[PDB]
From a paper:
Transport of soluble cargos across the NE occurs solely through nuclear pore complexes (NPCs), massive, proteinaceous assemblies that sit in circular openings where inner and outer nuclear membranes fuse, effectively perforating the NE. Here we report the structures of the [name]-[name] C-terminal α-helical domain and [name] N-terminal β-propeller from [name].
Again, this resolution precluded the building of the CDR loops for both nanobodies, and a nanobody model without CDRs was rigid body positioned into the map at the site of clear difference density for [name]. In addition, [name] and [name] are conformationally flexible in solution, such that crystal packing and nanobody chaperoning together most likely only partially increase order.
Numbering used by the authors:
A (entry chain C): 1 to 26, 36 to 49, 59 to 98, 122 to 131
B (entry chain A): 7 to 26, 34 to 92, 112 to 147, 167 to 225, 239 to 368, 381 to 726
C (entry chain D): 1 to 26, 36 to 49, 59 to 73, 77 to 98, 119 to 128
D (entry chain B): 519 to 689, 707 to 854, 866 to 931, 941 to 1157
The structure:
Amino acid sequence: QLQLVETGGGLVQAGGSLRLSCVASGWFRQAPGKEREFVADYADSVKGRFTISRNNDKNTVYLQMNNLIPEDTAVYYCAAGQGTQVTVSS
Amino acid sequence: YQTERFTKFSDTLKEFKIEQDPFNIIREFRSAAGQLALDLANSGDESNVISSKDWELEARFWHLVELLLVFRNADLDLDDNKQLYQIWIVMVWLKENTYVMERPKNVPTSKWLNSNVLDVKDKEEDHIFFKYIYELILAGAIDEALEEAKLSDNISICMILCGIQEYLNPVIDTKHSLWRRTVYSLSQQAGLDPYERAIYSYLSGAIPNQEVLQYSDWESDLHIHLNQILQTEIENYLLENNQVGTDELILPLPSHALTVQEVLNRVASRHPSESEHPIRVLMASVILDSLPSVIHSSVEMLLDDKPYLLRIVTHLAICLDIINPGSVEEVDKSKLITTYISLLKLQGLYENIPIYATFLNESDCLEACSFILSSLEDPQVRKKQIETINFLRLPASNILRRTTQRVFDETEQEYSPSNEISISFDVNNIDMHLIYGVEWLIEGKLYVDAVHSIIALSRRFLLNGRVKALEQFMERNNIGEICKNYELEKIADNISKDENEDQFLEEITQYEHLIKGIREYEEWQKSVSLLSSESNIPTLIEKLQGFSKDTFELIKTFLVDLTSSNFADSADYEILYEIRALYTPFLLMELHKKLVEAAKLLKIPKFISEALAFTSLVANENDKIYLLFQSSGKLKEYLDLVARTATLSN
Amino acid sequence: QVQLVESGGGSVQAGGSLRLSCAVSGWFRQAPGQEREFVAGYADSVKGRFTISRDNTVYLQMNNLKPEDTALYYCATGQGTQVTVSS
Amino acid sequence: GFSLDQESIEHDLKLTSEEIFHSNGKYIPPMLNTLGQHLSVRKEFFQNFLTFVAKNFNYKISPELKLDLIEKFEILNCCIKFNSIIRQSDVLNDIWEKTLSNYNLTQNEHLTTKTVVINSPDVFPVIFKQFLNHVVFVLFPSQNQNFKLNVTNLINLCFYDGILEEGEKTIPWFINFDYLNCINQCFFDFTFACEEEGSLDSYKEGLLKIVKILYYQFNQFKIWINTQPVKSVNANDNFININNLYDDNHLDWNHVLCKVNLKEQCIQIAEFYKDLSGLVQTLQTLDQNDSTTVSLYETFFNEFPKEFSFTLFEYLIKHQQHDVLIQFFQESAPKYGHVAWIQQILDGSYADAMNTLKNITVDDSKKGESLSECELHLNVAKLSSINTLRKIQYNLDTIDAEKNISNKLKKGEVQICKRFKNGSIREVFNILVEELKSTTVVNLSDLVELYSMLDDEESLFIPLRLLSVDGNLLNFEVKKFLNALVWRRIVLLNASNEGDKLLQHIVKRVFDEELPKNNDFPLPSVDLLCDKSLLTPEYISETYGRFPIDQNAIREEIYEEISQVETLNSDNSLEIKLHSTIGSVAKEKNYTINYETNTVEY
């Protein structure tokens, strides 16, 4: 029963920032209706705006999202997660 | 939702069509098979895993196929070896999506608690932590193996993690030629657990003992040939480069890498009861692109079947024809467009648009567009859903024409009994569906090709009950379109406008006149003994029945004869001569039918007699009522029906 | 460069059994005079008596052999192996 | 010889028996009263002896002559018993006897009536007939119950003379005359009781009639068998004369009265009488033609029973289509008349074709209700598909003409032919109004005569169209006389309507409808119109034979109608007045004058 605790999601405005922290108790996205697509290698729709980082030798993943738009409002899941909602209002 | 697997697939396809960015047709395939295997494992009965195991494997294959189609196509002109890159695409799906046992519970605090001083259960607790670490490293868990190696006081395994981290810094570069020959010699030394003995050979590209492979699954079994080719292709190119030197070399390595087919000849031979499963052997055909070679081979041994395979092979071609134009075989394409529309019978109500994305030639020609004329019967839901998918004009003129001409050959047996009765219940139950395809095609310009279908069934009535009278009621259920066909007819140019507009207007007058006589004859027969003793209302109603009939006869005789005599289109005249000759005798008996029921009142005797006696007398000036007896055979019938008035009127 | 090596052919009595092995190295049948026909899917004349199996290897267990099966058998993905059944 | 000597001894016994049947020497006449009963019982007993002794003993017609001589004395004896009942009635009998008295004294002197019954009292039937003739003013004069209560006794007295014929084993002119003159008065009985009927009261005299019908039946059905036997035996028809006159007239009148009596009867009584008495098969059948019911129970059994009824076949001609084809129309009967349209018989039937040809040829004489034949001539033409062209022309012309004529007539669109005034010579106006009012123009026989009536020029114009279309029937003389009368009416109207404007529409209507090409229409002329060479008494009596007016009046009317024009045509102006007109009209039209025969060409 290895777990994946994700936190940091929330509701921001168009142009705001967020910081998703993922601690593996032991980054893909899914929009409302579409299929799970990979976000972070970087997706073509988030290259230059999202930054990924990892602690060397540890099982932790941080995603800093700057310049958020209404096309990034979805549920983010972790993979190596239950899901964390990240909405951006227009 | 979950039950309708096909419906979910259709929705993904529809979204792509609306957009018409091309790699999204297969990515949606990962959201269907996943939620299915999740809906049988999140909550419910545990025995549903016998069917959820089929969904737990159909979703990992769609992940492996998404990296192979984007590498051989999306070659952007950004800032060498194109066949060696397939090994990396095989390692991503072989490492991320693998089985991993969780961390062991009840880990001992200190070491050797039961204490050759250790019991038999001590080397097992040491091998238990040895197998928990020997598995995480094979799946790419460095981030986890690095912490796992430090956590269990398992420092004996950390010396190779950086050696791999040093081998990972050399792989990103794309000396260590001597370090590859020491671990292989370390695999020949005695004194090692079975799990650690297989870990030293897997990283270098060697084959360990068969006792460690017995446990190994035939699916995993494929990583043996994958790591050997990498250890040999780098030593070959590494050898070619010779960036270590001859001295740096110690032992000769099998630098002769084989192909995929020589490796597949051994993975399906070690554990064939599961390595040749129908959902795992599809990855070799993606490297060969032979679509109809795995499904058309299960239709010959009918003496001794899998719906998940037909939905993927057919969905592949709509993408294969799109990924590379004509990548799917043209014979296989039309064979996949036909096998899909036929197998989609239980779900054919919603997929009446997804089959148009790969129209190709089965849709431009009258091939895949004639099957819809077999289900469109009564429900108005499927008739309106086909209006989308950007299909109209000639396709609407080829589905409506294939709907009325394909049932005309089945009524050929309805023209043989020219002098007997027949079974007309099927015609009175299937031709009703033969008028909804034209009534739904509300096109004022495509009205000439369908307005003659009813008149083409007047001769199938023959004697006894007539089918045109019931057909006249189907047209009354959708009249008013005559106003839409008369206004739209003055939009397109026509040369023979003096004969095409006169036949449609005359047929509507005779049919409406026919539908009126049928309802007038149904109200007098349903009268029977109406009004009871108060026949005063009948004394005026029967008077109206006897006037409306004596007028209807002289009027129906003038509508059929209004076709004049000599006309070029005499084929339309030889067919209407019998229907006019068949509506004559039924009228004289209705007045005489007031001598069986209205004979209790001596009032229809002196009236209905002379009214029907002269009905043949004046039927001798307009060319002797033509010869309606010559077109039906009813001559002595008129001679006896009227002759009976000589024993009642006197 | 590739093909098939086959082994296991021979001469048996009517009703006996043989085991054709075929591997790539390093089913069809032809009677004398007639044209080559596919054996194993399975032909109608061998269904229930011949069993095909595969681990690029293919084995054909021929049980209840009859004189009509006397032919040269060839592997395909071979040079031919004679299988003769005497009445 | 021996049978003649025995017959002589029997005749002497018969004379003494006649005296003994009316008076007997041994008995004391003074004792009691007139022993007519004993005088009769004596001869009655002696009759049993005569029968038992003369067992067989038949020679030629001597036994039949003796059996006939028996009824000369046995029948009279049953009258005095009525007298006894009449002696119970007294006042009637005394008034009767006294009347009889005067009768004899006026008829044969002999001291009025003395009830000695000398010479067998044969005059008893003559007295009975005189009394029956006087009862039509004496009792018809008296109430039905009175005369009804009276006639019952005479009925019961007469009905006692048939039980002796079945007792003598019954197997000459005297036998035919023994009871035949009484038929001259028997017919005065039933009516006298039946005319009163239930005396205008049925709910109480139904039984009074049911108790009396027996006497009428027994009189009629028995007296009727004597005629045909006497007639076949006597063969008087030759002489015939007063015997036949009485006989045959009485026979017809009795057939009329026996059938109504058969109708007014109790259930199956006439049916039994029809079977019992083989006579008046038609009157029997009239009672039997489903008078009671159409029930298949009794009717099929009565029907099937006829068997040898050839006569029944004539029954079907009363007023169907039963009797198992009944050999078609009773072997197609004889002259069908209207039954001929029925003789279609679900077949083309050549006779049925001749039948409508017979319907036109039967419109020739005393016909009616042509709308049948009119629709049935068209119908028979349809059934068929020389005579065909003639039939088509007859159908078309007669039908269209009768229709237009009845319409215009009943319509009265054209008010009147002005010239006629107060002339007997022509009641054709009233005859034609009557014809048009009913019976499909009363079959419309005088199609010729119809056109003669002219009231508006438009109504008069058509005639020559029928004349040039279907005028292949009458003689040339008849057709020319028609055309001449027409032209004469035209001239009399055109000289009056200033300008002679009547011909200017007809000369155009005859050429715009193309009548000369399909009709060799003879050209009218002064000589053609003033042509009295076709005026003969035979043609007059043939054409105007319906109206029973003197032919002299019609001849005078026709001579005046001809001479008016013969005098008005001064210098023969009419000639030019026609020639110029017709020739100016038929000029631009494909028409030329054929002065060789006074016709029109092209």
